[PDB]
Paper text:
In order to co-crystallize PLpro with ubiquitin, a semisynthetic version of ubiquitin containing a C-terminal aldehyde functional group was employed for crystallization. The PLpro-Ubal structure was determined to a resolution of 2.75 Å, with one PLpro and one Ubal monomer comprising the asymmetric unit. As expected for ubiquitin-specific proteases, the body of ubiquitin makes contacts with the palm and fingers regions of PLpro, with little perturbation to the overall enzyme structure. The interactions at the PLpro-Ubal protein-protein interface are comprised of van der Waals contacts and both direct and water-mediated hydrogen bonds. Directly adjacent to this loop, the hydrophobic patch of ubiquitin (I44, V70, and L8), often the focal point of many ubiquitin-protein interactions, makes extensive contacts with the side chains of M209 and P248 on PLpro. Despite the complete burial of PLpro's palm domain and a significant portion of the body of ubiquitin, the vast majority of PLpro-ubiquitin interactions involve the 5 C-terminal residues of ubiquitin (R72-G76). In this area, 12 intermolecular hydrogen bonds align and direct the ubiquitin C-terminus to the catalytic cysteine (C112) in the active site of PLpro. The flexible beta-turn loop that blocks the tunnel to the PLpro active site in the unbound enzyme undergoes a significant conformational change and becomes significantly more ordered as it interacts with the C-terminus of ubiquitin. The electron density associated with this loop is well resolved and the motion of the loop opens the active site of PLpro to accommodate and to hydrogen bond to the side chain of R74 on ubiquitin. The structure of PLpro bound to ubiquitin-aldehyde illustrates how the multi-domain architecture of an enzyme can distinguish different ubiquitin chains and ubiquitin-like proteins by forming the support structure for two separate ubiquitin binding domains.
All coronaviruses such as the SARS virus and the recently identified Middle East Respiratory Syndrome (MERS) virus encode in their genomes at least one papain-like protease (PLpro) enzyme that has two distinct functions in viral pathogenesis. The first function is to process the viral polyprotein into individual proteins that are essential for viral replication. The second function is to remove ubiquitin and ISG15 proteins from host cell proteins, which likely helps coronaviruses short circuit the host's innate immune response. PLpro, required for proteolytic processing of the SARS-CoV replicase polyprotein, structurally resembles the ubiquitin specific protease (USP) class of human deubiquitinating enzymes (DUBs) and has been shown to have both deubiquitinating and deISGylating activities.
Numbering used by the authors:
A (entry chain A): 1 to 76
B (entry chain B): 1 to 316
The structure:
């Protein structure tokens, strides 16, 4: 299926995934498509944090859902 | 004239100590491998004279001590002890001053984030399931936070000196907190696709990423619908002691009597620095060991905490 990832700037990318795909793997498709290192990526769904070690199916992500990409903060 | 007895105890979990006696000259790890003393990897060293009436740390062995370990830490990770100890060596050196009625942490090894965490927990009606974290926590509220801080790093897979996200760190911690009676109920209203209701429990009941305003989540935030229109999400029922609203750092106004506490993130796409804001008889800005009071504040807020008991909505 295809899903959408909306960036912080509001730019929307189309991704090609499967409900078996992991969050890790989803980040790899993003990296491949927008050059963003996976260790910077954090995936949000309608406000809900998608845990790094999990799968789309765990969070019932449907065809054409929109995911939000936020950044891992690096505070000292 | 002498003896090969130094008399020290070995354990995994502070509480129950075991006893294994070795020679005065027999080193620790040549026989029991990974062994620690207050963090000091004493794997390769000779027993001494001061080593008496004390306690030691080791990896579990007889698959019973792995149960004795789990029933204190709530983890099956064997690397946990090492990452906890390698980090306790540094944390024990930090200073924990009482700023504004709360236990803070002096700037060191990029611990500003750990400081927000600790500062906010002491304001929230919350308890830990893991015994390690609840005992370390009790001492932490009293000024003894070296172990709490080391724990946090260990549960978060973060090393000392490493930069950190307060929201992510709070998340690792709430995994081990009691939030089983935490309940959030959301409606999403699409003009075409209809109204969906969903229920959330546990950590996910109290976290949100997209707005700092608890009031916005009650009057409706805008999310994409699967059909291509925008829909409206809104809180219908919340049952928890607190909520944590979070959003990418952005300028926000903080005025007393509308929130509990919060934290700001000044920086950019790479580095950054957290300071903590709490509300008392006025606003307290707490950066590490430094306090400042102000009537009002505006700046790069990223998380806000709000007190909650029970809430139901006035919509549909
Ligand atoms: Zn729709």
């Amino acid at each position: 299926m295809q899903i959408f990832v909306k960036t912080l700037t509001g730019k929307t990318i189309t991704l090609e995934v499967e409900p078996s795909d992991t969050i890790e793997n989803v980040k790899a498709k993003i990296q491949d498509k927008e050059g963003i290192p996976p260790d910077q990526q954090r995936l949000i769904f309608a406000g809900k944090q998608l845990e790094d070690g999990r799968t789309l199916s765990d969070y019932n992500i449907q065809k054409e859902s929109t995911l939000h990409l936020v950044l891992r903060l690096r505070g000292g | 004239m002498e003896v090969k007895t130094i008399k020290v105890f070995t354990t995994v979990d502070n509480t129950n100590l075991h006893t294994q006696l070795v020679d005065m000259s027999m080193t620790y790890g040549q026989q029991f491998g990974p062994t620690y003393l207050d963090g000091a990897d004493v794997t390769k060293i000779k027993p001494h004279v001061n080593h008496e009436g004390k306690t030691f740390f080791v990896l579990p062995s007889d698959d019973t001590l792995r149960s004795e370990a789990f029933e204190y830490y709530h983890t099956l990770d064997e690397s946990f002890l090492g990452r906890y100890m390698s980090a306790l060596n540094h944390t024990k050196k930090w200073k924990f001053p009482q700023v504004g009625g709360l236990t803070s942490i002096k700037w060191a090894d990029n611990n500003c984030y750990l400081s927000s965490v600790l500062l906010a927990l002491q304001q929230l009606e919350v308890k830990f399931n893991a015994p390690a974290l609840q005992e370390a926590y009790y001492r932490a509220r009293a000024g003894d936070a070296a172990n709490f801080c080391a724990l946090i790093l260990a549960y978060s897979n973060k090393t000392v000196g490493e930069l950190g996200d307060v929201r992510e760190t709070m998340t690792h911690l709430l995994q081990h907190a009691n939030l089983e009676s935490a309940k959030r109920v959301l409606n999403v209203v699409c003009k075409h696709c209809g109204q969906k209701t969903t229920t959330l429990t546990g950590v996910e009941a109290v976290m949100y990423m997209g707005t700092l305003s608890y009031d916005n989540l009650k009057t409706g935030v805008s999310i994409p619908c699967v059909c291509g229109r925008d829909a409206t999400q809104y809180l219908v029922q919340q049952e928890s002691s607190f909520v944590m609203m979070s959003a990418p750092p952005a300028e926000y106004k903080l005025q007393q009597g509308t929130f509990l506490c919060a934290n700001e993130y000044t920086g950019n796409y790479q580095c950054g620095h957290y300071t903590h804001i709490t509300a008392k008889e006025t606003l307290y800005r707490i950066d590490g060991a430094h306090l400042t009071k102000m009537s009002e504040y505006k700046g790069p807020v990223t998380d806000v905490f709000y007190k909650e008991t029970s809430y139901t909505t006035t919509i549909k």
